[PDB]
């Protein structure tokens, strides 16, 4: 998200983060965005939720299409540029890059893809820039009459119009099955010497907490008296019993 660079216009780039712990409210708690759209869930309330992975479409656009790239939308994209699953499960956040995607004097790279004859399956990546043909005769690898580029230019300037304005765009459809990344766990300090209804290292129960003289094994978390009834708790963390 704080990522400096997103993909080119025609090359929406997929990114995943997994096999770690993510704090999702701080990502929600940034307010630096002209776009914060989460569907199915809020940008918050994911810290108690663990997911296997999420895929982020990365690219550089103009502000007019901060709307145009999203599931459930219809238009030139849904027919000619980009189709997304009808059962999208995720979120779309984006933030403006109006002064941030054009280079001084004009980035002498600027080219732009909107349209392309082809067709799009849900969540499909297309980059082709070929001259558009509606059928009169083979172009024979030649542009000109009835062989015309289906991709107007945005043409980004530092003073880009709002429709023209570059925006940092992230399209998130969440993948879950073996979830890896949730909030931190929530959690508190470590306190002792009081009869408490506890959550011990995810083990929910009750009792008075006091220091243990018992010798636990390095992985050993808990001990249960006969009948499988807890007897001591290892600090999950400082591994102190």
């Amino acid at each position, epitope marked *: 998200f704080n990522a400096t660079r997103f993909a080119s216009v025609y090359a929406w780039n997929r990114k995943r983060i997994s096999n770690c712990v993510a704090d999702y409210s701080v990502l929600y708690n940034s307010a630096s965005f002209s776009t914060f759209k989460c569907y199915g869930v809020s940008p918050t309330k994911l810290n108690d939720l663990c997911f296997t992975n999420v895929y982020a479409d990365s690219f550089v656009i103009r502000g007019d299409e901060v709307r145009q790239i999203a599931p459930g939308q219809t238009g030139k994209i849904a027919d000619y540029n980009y189709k997304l699953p009808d059962d999208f499960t995720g979120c779309v956040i984006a933030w403006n890059s109006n002064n941030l995607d054009s280079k001084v004097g*004009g980035n*002498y790279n600027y080219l732009y*893809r909107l349209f392309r004859k082809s067709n799009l399956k849900p969540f499909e990546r297309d980059i082709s820039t070929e001259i558009y043909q509606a059928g009169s005769t083979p172009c024979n690898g030649v*542009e000109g009459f009835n062989c015309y580029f289906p991709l107007q230019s945005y043409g980004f300037q530092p003073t880009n119009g709002v429709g023209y304005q570059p925006y940092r765009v992230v399209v998130l459809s969440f993948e879950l099955l073996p979830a890896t990344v949730c909030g931190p766990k929530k959690s508190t300090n470590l306190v002792k010497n009081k009869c408490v209804n506890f959550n011990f290292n995810g083990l929910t129960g009750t009792g008075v907490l006091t220091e243990s003289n018992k010798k636990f094994l390095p992985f050993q978390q808990f001990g249960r008296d006969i009948a499988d009834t807890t007897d001591a708790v290892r600090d999950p963390q400082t591994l102190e019993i």
Partner: nanobody
Framework: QVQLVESGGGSVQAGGSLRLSCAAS????????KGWYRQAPGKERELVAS???????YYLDSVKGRLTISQDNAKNTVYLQMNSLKPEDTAVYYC?????????????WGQGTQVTVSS
């Protein structure tokens, strides 16, 4: 308008190196993408390499590693350094310059320079 002129083509034995030069003239501020196209005899035009203003570059799998595309902003020229040339590389190479304002095509094309690699 923008003017593209190619130079540096010629005949080279297989395994040699060639550097093609494309000098842009006119309204340079309008040019956006610069890349090299080649059209081997009997084949269609293909994108060999393209470079972004920021410096981002991409190459076709056939030429990747052997060919490098760079720019000289002061010279207003883009170069195609061809190393370890193969007879397959023989074709007419076109410098292509995109126009910024326009449907971002390769609005400007060069005359094209023929590079022949002997075996």
């Amino acid at each position: 308008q923008v003017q593209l002129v190619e130079s540096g083509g010629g005949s080279v034995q297989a395994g040699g190196s060639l550097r093609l030069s494309c000098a842009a003239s006119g309204y340079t501020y309008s040019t956006c993408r610069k890349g090299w196209y080649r059209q081997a005899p009997g084949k269609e035009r293909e994108l060999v390499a393209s470079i972004t203003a920021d410096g981002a570059t991409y190459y076709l799998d056939s030429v990747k590693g052997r060919l490098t595309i760079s720019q000289d902003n002061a010279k207003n020229t883009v170069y195609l350094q061809m190393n370890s040339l193969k007879p397959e590389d023989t074709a007419v190479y076109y410098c292509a310059a995109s126009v910024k304002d326009f449907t971002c095509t390769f609005n400007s094309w060069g005359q094209g320079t023929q590079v022949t690699v002997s075996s």
